[PDB]
Each structure stands twice: as structure tokens, then as C-alpha cells.
Amino acid sequence: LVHVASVEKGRSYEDFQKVYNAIALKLREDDEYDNYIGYGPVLVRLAWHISGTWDKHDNTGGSYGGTYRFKKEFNDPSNAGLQNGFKFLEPIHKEFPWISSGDLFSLGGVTAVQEMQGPKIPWRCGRVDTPEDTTPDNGRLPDADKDAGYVRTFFQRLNMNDREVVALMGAHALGKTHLKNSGYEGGGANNVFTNEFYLNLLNEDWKLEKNDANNEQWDSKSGYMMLPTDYSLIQDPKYLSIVKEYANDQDKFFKDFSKAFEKLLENGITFPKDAPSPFIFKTLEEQGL
Numbered sequence: 001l002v003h004v005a006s007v008e009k010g011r012s013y014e015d016f017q018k019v020y021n022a023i024a025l026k027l028r029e030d031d032e033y034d035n036y037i038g039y040g041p042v043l044v045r046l047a048w049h050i051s052g053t054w055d056k057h058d059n060t061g062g063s064y065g066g067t068y069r070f071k072k073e074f075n076d077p078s079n080a081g082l083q084n085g086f087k088f089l090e091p092i093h094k095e096f097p098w099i100s101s102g103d104l105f106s107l108g109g110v111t112a113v114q115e116m117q118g119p120k121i122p123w124r125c126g127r128v129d130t131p132e133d134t135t136p137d138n139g140r141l142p143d144a145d146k147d148a149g150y151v152r153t154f155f156q157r158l159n160m161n162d163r164e165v166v167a168l169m170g171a172h173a174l175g176k177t178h179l180k181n182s183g184y185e186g187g188g189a190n191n192v193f194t195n196e197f198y199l200n201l202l203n204e205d206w207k208l209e210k211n212d213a214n215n216e217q218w219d220s221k222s223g224y225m226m227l228p229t230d231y232s233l234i235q236d237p238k239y240l241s242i243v244k245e246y247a248n249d250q251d252k253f254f255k256d257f258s259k260a261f262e263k264l265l266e267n268g269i270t271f272p273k274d275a276p277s278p279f280i281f282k283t284l285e286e287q288g289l
């Protein structure tokens with residue numbers, strides 16, 4: 001399958017900066033969500049789950065088609081909780097009805113990372129909504145109870161290598177787990193994008209415990225948690241080296257995360273040679289807004 005990016009008619013940087021700014025202003029305004037974490041983390045997770053359905057083998061799934069708007073995908077058990085992000089984006093969709101659904105979902109994740117003081121993430125427009133029958137079946141997103149070999153194999157389907165996997169997982173610094181969504185609980189209330197996932201992995205005293213859903217997770221006394229798949233990144237010697245690298249170099253982590261996250265959000269999309277260059281949006285803070 002080929003999905004060619006098609007720029008929303010007549011739109012340019014300034015139009016998408018306006019959408020970014022509306023998302024960013026709403027992030028600031030609706031600060032109470034999830035015990036004052038705000039919507040940033042769930043928007044990052046939404047952007048990832050709408051992209052992470054991709055299969056490199058046949059170009060099914062992926063962000064292009066905006067298929068999360070359809071019930072089969074909306075109701076994937078793996079997506080429990082993301083409805084909160086969707087609801088956040090509804091007024092944005094209403095104000096800017098011209099932006100495609102995949103563009104909106106992916107731009108929500110970019111805006112969230114940047115407004116949380118993360119790296120700049122270049123972003124390209126032109127995803128085009130596709131019909132309900134193009135929605136991927138449930139079961140393409142990863143399980144959390146597994147080991148490093150599972151993680152490694154899983155991410156090959158998304159064309160991600162060890163460095164890209166470890167970099168992407170650093171998003172688990174953000175937000176928290178919720179027992180009712182995933183069968184995992186805790187992790188704090190962080191809404192600042194940092195390399196602390198890696199520092200916490202290396203420096204905390206982790207205990208393997210059973211949570212109230214009878215699933216195993218690693219807990220620290222300071223309130224952080226690691227999923228089994230997170231902890232696998234320090235069990236496997238190749239992953240461990242990269243964890244150490246990112247724990248010791250904030251800038252390197254930022255740069256690698258930015259590349260991997262853009263790639264994730266763009267998997268499956270063919271950009272014409274004369275497509276616009278990727279946009280780098282200014283934060284509200286940079287604009288004095």
C-alpha cells in the first residue's frame with residue numbers, strides 16, 4: 001500500500017502553528033486533568049498508539065489514515081484511557097476542521113512534547129483520512145509483561161532498532177499508569193520532559209511487586225515504577241549500554257528521541273520530492289504567548 005502525503009489545500013507553516021498554539025493554550029488551560037498532570041502525557045501516548053499500529057511488511061496501520069476515529073480502534077483494549085486525549089482534541093478539530101485526523105493526532109503529540117520542555121520535534125503535514133475499512137485490527141500494540149527479546153522483536157515491525165527503542169521508551173518519564181486502563185498503577189505525576197526514566201532505572205532501588213490487579217511491576221520507595229518491559233532495558237546488555245548513555249547525556253537523549261519520534265509518526269507515509277520541508281513549531285514560551 002502507498003500513502004502519499006497531500007498538503008491540506010492552501011495551508012502553510014502559519015496555519016499549522018495556529019493549530020499548535022490552540023493545542024498548547026488548551027494544555028495550559030485544562031491543567032487539572034489527572035490530578036494536575038495535565039493532558040501532555042496522554043497526548044504523547046495517543047500520538048504513539050495511532051502510529052504504533054503500523055506494519056512495515058504491508059504498510060497497514062500507521063498514522064496516515066487517522067483511523068483511531070473509528071470504533072474498532074478507539075475501543076482497542078490497548079488504547080484504554082486515550083479517549084481522554086481524543087476528547088481534549090475535539091474542540092481543536094472543531095475550530096480547525098481542515099486538519100486531517102492523523103495530522104491532528106500526531107501534532108498533538110509533538111505539541112505536548114515541546115510544551116513539556118522536550119526537544120523540538122520536526123513535523124510534516126499531509127496525512128489523509130482513510131475509510132473505516134482501513135482501520136487495523138486490535139492487537140498490534142505491545143504487551144507490558146514481557147522481556148527484552150519480546151521488545152526487540154516487537155519493534156522490528158515498526159522498523160526501530162535498539163537505540164530507537166531505548167530512546168522512545170524514555171517517554172515513560174511522563175504521566176503515570178492507571179490500574180483501570182492497563183492493569184498497572186503508579187509512577188508519579190511528572191509532566192516535564194527529561195531523561196529521568198534512565199536515571200531512575202539505574203539509580204533507584206527496585207522491588208518486583210504484585211499490584212492490585214495481580215500483575216507484576218517494579219516499584220521504588222520514591223514512587224516511580226517500571227513495567228516489566230521497561231525493566232528489561234537494564235536486563236539486556238545491549239539495551240543497558242544505551243540506557244547508561246542517555247542517563248549521562250540529556251542532549252543526546254533529546255536529539256535521538258526527536259529523530260525516533262518523528263520517524264514513528266511518519267512511518268508508512270510517502271512524501272513527494274516537492275513536499276514542504278518539515279515544520280519546527282515555536283513554543284508558546286518562545287512566542288511570548
Ligand code: HEM
Nearest residue numbers: 041042044045048142143144168171175176177178181182
Ligand atoms: C514496549 C513498549 C511499551 C509498552 C509495553 C508500553 C506500555 C504502557 C502502559 C501499560 C502504560 C500505562 C497506560 C495507563 O494505564 O494509562 C503506558 C503509559 C504511557 N506510555 Fe507507554 N508503552 C510502551 C512504549 C511507549 C512509547 C514508545 C511511548 C511514546 C514515545 C509511550 C508513551 C507513554 C506515555 C506518555 C504514557 C503515560 C500516559 C498517561 O500518563 O496517561 N509508551 N505505556
